[PDB]
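Incident log, support desk, overnight shift.

02:14 A customer reports that sequence design results differ from what the structure should imply. Their input is reproduced verbatim below. On-call engineer (initials T.W.) acknowledged and began investigating.
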């Protein structure tokens, strides 16, 4: 595959123009061969700027950087990231990167080139939609969106459905909070009828997701477990059953109050409620939620009572069957959100890393990028935290520009992003960083470096956001927020950061100028970009020693350098489903370093998530890998994560 990749890049170079401004002119002049219609594939404002600075821009680009991409990463770029004219790729990766850089920075050519170099050297990456759409007409640069139901009426349900349609069309994933919609059997005063509840409503969402493609629609549906239709909700993804009791193309998440977990643990009863009868449960959290909920129980405003454990069993069994629902702890998400001055946060997003406020007037937006953590390790096996912080500042300014540039699919999204200016900086290559540092994932050394990486990210992000506020003013809803009061994320976990960074001085800078962004950090999945860049995904442990059979480059390098490589090892790894643990020739220090996600404790995975979690103001797309699951294991895992203070206790459950 190494030679294959070079030939394919060489072929693309052969088959494309060299000069960036030339390619930009061809893209802009494009004429539809069917229509004879002039449909520019790049925006005029962007072309104007490129032609006006063509010598600097053209001569900045380093075409040899195209050879950096591995075989499958490059094919993925050819497949979806490089603009085509009549089915033939016109952009080199370098062209697309500069198109992106100018797309974000406009007149600021200094800025564009700095971004172009970071991106082309692979220090970080913008999100797929940004890479698709930057520098094009009506550019939709943001990844995903959150929304609440407008109202518990046919009017509201269908207006919200139209929003999802429009957003899906513009290539956004969606998280939707549905708990305010009344349940099965509940009275409808305007028709003198009774509601059929959530399921048939969700079947309309399900078919709308099948209908409207991203640029299939990906809608995660969020429900709080007090809702009367909670048991049916839990069946919607299952492969068995009647079509009318199924919504199999949606994704499912629970927005879990502390009270539920406490009542499961102490084996108490659990009241199911109808939201028309028991209003506002979704608009309070913590103690205020607890009081309200118990008050409705004392008022008899309850439709059904079950054992908390019977609903617990249903949740776990659904996860055993489908890997879902996702597990979010509502009170952890609200109690530790810088956005908590806005009101109660009703849901997360499609990938469970975004925690942002949504109302009938506001659709929250996820503005995302990831840092390639592997790049910050020196030949010395030391971590360049200073460089990591420096790159993080660049990314904050870039995402901040994206908020003002973005073409919003609905006006509610524009209003939310404009008022709160949240961003989500994540990571990839965490497992690679540890491997490069020679630290096993579970080691104490990895554990300290995990904290310190995320301390650095948060610090650098805050610093750039603060400089932005000094330059532009704080975001609109800043005063009255926890950070305006001197409360940073780790304080809300009661965590004292290491001595690596000077938080006292940063807090003084923030007390004086404030900050530009209500939120900053959010480790997202990185499924596409990690494969483009050749890193392990996001914060995940090592997936496998093999992925054409491509042995992991780091392992291959280490075994080659020791004299221990033999081409036979390939098939032994395959026979061991990606493991190197039972290969006798490989030394123990290497076996430890290259343990797979299936050989790594999930308890330590959750702990390490909680640990970094103190420095992540949003949440984290945290998958859980349990080869051989059972109810005790899942129970233990969820309760452990809940009690660690995790916002997102579980994204996907994976097994084998
Ligand atoms: C489910 C269980 C668990 C996951 C999280 C928190 C826990 C908290 C308390 C008790 C169990 C918990 C998990 N079981 S597991 O998936 O079979 C497994 C065990 C060891 C290794 Br190595 C890899 C996978 C586990 N990880 N570590 C540990 O001790 O258990
Ligand atoms: C009319 C109708 C409503 N519903 C649901 C949609 C909402 O969740 C809920 C109320 O719909 P609404 O459209 O609010 O009905 P309404 O205003 O006539 O009556 P009320 O004053 O009681 O609101 O009932 C159905 O599930 N099926 C139906 O055929
Ligand atoms: Mg009504």
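02:41 Re-run completed on a clean worker. Output:
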């Amino acid at each position: 595959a190494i030679l294959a990749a070079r030939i394919a890049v060489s072929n693309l170079h052969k088959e494309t123009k060299k000069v960036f401004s030339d390619v930009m002119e061809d893209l802009y002049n494009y004429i539809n061969p069917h229509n004879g219609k002039h449909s520019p594939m790049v925006a005029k404002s962007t072309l104007d700027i490129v032609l006006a600075n063509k010598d600097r821009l053209n001569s900045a680009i380093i075409y040899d950087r195209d050879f950096s991409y591995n075989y499958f990463g490059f094919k993925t770029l050819e497949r979806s990231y490089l603009l085509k004219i009549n089915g033939k790729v016109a952009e080199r990766p370098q062209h697309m990167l500069m198109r992106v850089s100018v797309g974000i920075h406009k007149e600021d050519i200094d800025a564009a080139i700095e971004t172009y170099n970071l991106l082309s050297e692979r220090w970080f990456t913008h999100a797929s939609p940004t890479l698709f759409n930057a520098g094009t007409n009506r550019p939709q640069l943001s990844s995903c969106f959150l929304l609440s139901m407008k109202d518990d009426s046919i009017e509201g349900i269908y207006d919200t459905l139209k929003q999802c349609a429009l957003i899906s069309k513009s290539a956004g994933g969606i998280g939707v909070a549905v708990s305010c919609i009344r349940a099965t059997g509940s009275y409808i005063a305007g028709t003198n009828g009774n509601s059929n509840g959530l399921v048939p409503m969700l079947r309309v969402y399900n078919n709308t997701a099948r209908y409207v493609d991203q640029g299939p629609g990906a809608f995660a549906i969020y429900l709080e477990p007090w809702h009367l239709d909670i048991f049916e909700f839990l069946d919607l993804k299952k492969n068995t059953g009647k079509e009318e009791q199924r919504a199999r193309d949606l994704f499912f998440a629970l927005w879990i109050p502390d009270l539920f977990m406490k009542r499961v643990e102490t084996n108490q009863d659990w009241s199911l409620m109808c939201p028309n009868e028991c209003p506002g449960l979704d608009e309070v959290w913590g103690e205020e939620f607890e009081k309200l909920y118990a008050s409705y129980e004392k008022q008899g405003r309850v439709r059904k009572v079950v054992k908390a454990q019977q609903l617990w069993y249903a949740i776990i069994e659904s996860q055993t069957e489908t890997g879902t629902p996702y597990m979010l702890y509502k009170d952890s998400c609200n109690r530790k959100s810088n956005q908590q001055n806005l009101g109660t946060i009703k849901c997360s997003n499609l990938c469970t890393e975004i925690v942002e406020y949504t109302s009938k007037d506001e659709v929250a937006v996820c503005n995302l990028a990831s840092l390639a953590l592997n790049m910050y390790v020196t030949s010395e096996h030391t971590y360049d935290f200073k460089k990591l912080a420096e790159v993080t500042k660049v990314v904050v300014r870039n995402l901040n520009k994206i908020i003002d540039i973005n073409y919003y699919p609905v006006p509610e999204a524009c209003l939310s992003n404009k008022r709160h200016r949240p961003i989500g900086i994540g990571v990839q290559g965490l497992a690679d960083a540890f491997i490069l540092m020679r630290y096993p994932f579970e080691s104490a050394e990895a554990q300290l470096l995990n904290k310190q990486i995320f301390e650095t990210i948060y610090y650098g992000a805050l610093e750039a956001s603060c400089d932005l506020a000094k330059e532009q003013g704080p975001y609109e809803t800043y005063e009255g927020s926890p950070v305006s009061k001197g409360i940073l994320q780790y304080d809300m976990w009661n965590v004292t950061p290491t001595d690596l960074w000077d938080w006292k001085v940063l807090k003084e800078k923030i007390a004086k100028y404030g900050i530009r962004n209500s939120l900053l950090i959010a480790p997202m999945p990185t499924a596409s970009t990690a494969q483009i860049l050749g890193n392990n995904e996001s914060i995940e442990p090592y997936t496998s020693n093999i992925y054409f059979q491509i042995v992991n480059p780091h392992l291959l390098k280490d075994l080659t350098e020791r004299g221990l490589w033999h081409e036979e090892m390939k098939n032994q790894i395959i026979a061991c489903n990606g493991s190197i643990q039972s290969i006798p020739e490989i030394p123990d220090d290497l076996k430890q370093l290259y343990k797979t996600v299936w050989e790594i404790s999930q308890k330590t995975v959750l702990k390490m998530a909680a640990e970094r979690g103190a420095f992540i103001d949003q949440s984290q797309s945290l998958n859980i890998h349990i080869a051989e699951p059972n109810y005790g294991k899942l129970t233990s895992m969820h309760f452990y994560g809940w009690k660690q203070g995790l916002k997102t206790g579980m994204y996907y459950l994976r097994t084998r």
